[PDB]
Amino acid sequence: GGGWLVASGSTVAMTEQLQMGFGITVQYGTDTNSVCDTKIA
């Protein structure tokens, strides 16, 4: 690319308990919804 990459980072003091984050993405369709039909059993 020819220049520089630059970044900066910030912090937050750790809490006593520990707090977390969870992101979810679900995908439906198109004929295979198998998290709750082409299985043998």
């Binding site: 520089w4 630059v6 900066s8």
Partner: protein
Amino acid sequence: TFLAYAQFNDTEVPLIEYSFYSDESLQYPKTVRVPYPKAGAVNPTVKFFVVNTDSLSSVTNATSIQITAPASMLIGDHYLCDVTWATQERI
């Protein structure tokens, strides 16, 4: 409403040292040490913050938002040379 502040870091800045003799009764002279960069030496670094003083609280350590220098500065040694407020909410 806001209080903007700078933070300087002299960690790697060389010390100048010199004697202070003081009053005739001080038996051993005091050696004064000052971080002082000479031409070419390692410089202090600077970071910039703003705190909202209206939302302070004793329940909670204040939150200082760090405002980061432009990219053209980040690539090498720089200084913060001016701080001017434009409006109640512009800096």
